[PDB]
């Protein structure tokens, strides 16, 4: 079987959402390196998500056999008889990155996560019938992209930044003018080195009174130019992005299975990570075959995409070696192994 060089994660049934997230984050090498620097020496291993992440990453980097995540599963606390076994990968990402970001505060790696993942946008509001305007600048760590009726990522970004009308039951509260018809638009101010895109493949269906998955065709490219969605571009640093990961969901809102396709080095050499099995695949198998629209294939398609900015790729994907793992952490982990 074609050499991949990468190890999988054990299939414990419900673990797939977290396994797919872990591979995605493990191959965000600059993040992996910072995770190894977190000061977990005093952490309670039964409680510490940060130590459990260090352990998983260490084993992904060193093991020749599928890696277990039991201590992460336990400390993260999501798969339980009172909280469901199957989970959303973007939810897990938001919660895991917040946990690690907090742990890095006050340390030599503080700020790593916002430096990698956080961007800024601005919302503008202008009233139509009175002279009243406002704006508001806000941070984001991922972008929710609408897909219904949109053919591709470009169209979704076009719609994201397009002017919309605030009227009817959605009039704007214009201070002492009260509710006013207004125009509202959003523009990106910065886009981060590592860009997480959440495809909103779901809707409420009033006909059946329930939420359903949208399995429609929606295309995304290997190379993604985003300068046109910025308020102001930088001629020395165009917002050109390169596809790194495709997190694929099969099923419906209420259950299914996750895998992740990655080209870890950003070089177009893709592999499929399906729990314990890592296999080489073609670009088409990672990209076009996850566009949706086949009417299991009919409900298998991309849900989360990871792009890396071309100018940041060599730093984000910098090599990670044993020189990057503190000896104190190596010793703690080997201590655990020997004890069993």
């Amino acid at each position: 079987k074609k050499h991949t060089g990468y190890v999988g994660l054990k299939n414990q049934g419900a673990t797939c959402y977290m396994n797919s997230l872990l591979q995605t984050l493990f191959f965000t090498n600059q993040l992996r390196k910072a995770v190894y620097m977190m000061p977990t020496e005093g952490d309670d291993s039964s409680k510490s998500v940060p130590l459990a992440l260090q352990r998983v990453f260490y084993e992904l980097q060193h093991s020749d056999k599928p890696v277990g995540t039991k201590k992460l599963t336990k400390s993260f606390g999501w798969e339980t008889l009172d909280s469901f076994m199957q989970h959303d990968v973007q939810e897990a990402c938001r919660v895991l990155l917040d946990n690690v970001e907090n742990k890095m505060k006050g340390t030599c790696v503080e700020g790593t996560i916002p430096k990698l993942f956080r961007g800024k946008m601005v919302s503008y509001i202008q009233c139509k019938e009175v002279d009243y305007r406002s704006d508001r600048r806000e941070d984001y760590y991922d972008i929710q992209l609408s897909i219904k009726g949109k053919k591709n990522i470009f169209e979704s970004f076009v719609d994201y930044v397009a002017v919309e009308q605030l009227d009817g039951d959605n009039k704007y509260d214009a201070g002492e003018h009260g509710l006013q018809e207004a125009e509202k638009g959003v523009k990106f101010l910065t886009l981060p080195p590592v860009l997480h895109l959440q495809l909103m493949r779901f809707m409420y269906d009033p006909q059946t009174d329930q939420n359903i998955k949208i399995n429609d065709r929606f295309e995304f490219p290997e190379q993604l130019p985003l300068d046109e969605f910025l308020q102001k571009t930088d001629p020395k640093d165009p917002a050109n992005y390169i596809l790194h990961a495709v997190l694929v969901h099969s099923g419906d809102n209420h259950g299914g299975h996750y895998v992740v396709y990655l080209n870890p080095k950003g070089d177009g050499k893709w592999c499929k990570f399906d729990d314990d099995v890592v296999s080489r695949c073609t670009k088409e198998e990672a990209i076009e075959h996850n566009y949706g629209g086949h009417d299991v294939r009919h409900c298998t398609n991309a849900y989360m995409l990871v792009y890396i900015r071309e100018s940041k790729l060599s730093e984000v994907l910098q090599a990670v070696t044993d020189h990057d793992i503190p000896q104190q952490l190596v010793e703690r982990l080997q201590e655990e192994k020997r004890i069993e």
Binding site: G13, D88, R94, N170, F202, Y204, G251, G256, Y303
Partner: protein, 76 residues
């Protein structure tokens, strides 16, 4: 105070809230306006998923803040 919510089609809706409103109250107002059951809603603000039991003031959500509504694709 009026906040904004980006819906599942990327459109902006308004919501009339108070700083002391809980996240559950906000989800109920989204249900009233958009019909989405609260137990399926997730709200993202500044990269944080908002937690039931906390209030808008806990997150420094103010007039003209935008929350992002998403659902879930659960998988194992």
């Amino acid at each position: 105070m009026q906040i904004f919510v980006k819906t599942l089609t990327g459109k902006t809706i308004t919501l009339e809230v108070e700083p002391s409103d809980t996240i559950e109250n906000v989800k109920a107002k989204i249900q009233d306006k958009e019909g989405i059951p609260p137990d399926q809603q997730r709200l993202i603000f500044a990269g944080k998923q908002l937690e039931d039991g906390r209030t808008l003031s806990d997150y420094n959500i103010q007039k003209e803040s935008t929350l992002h509504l998403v659902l879930r694709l659960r998988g194992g």
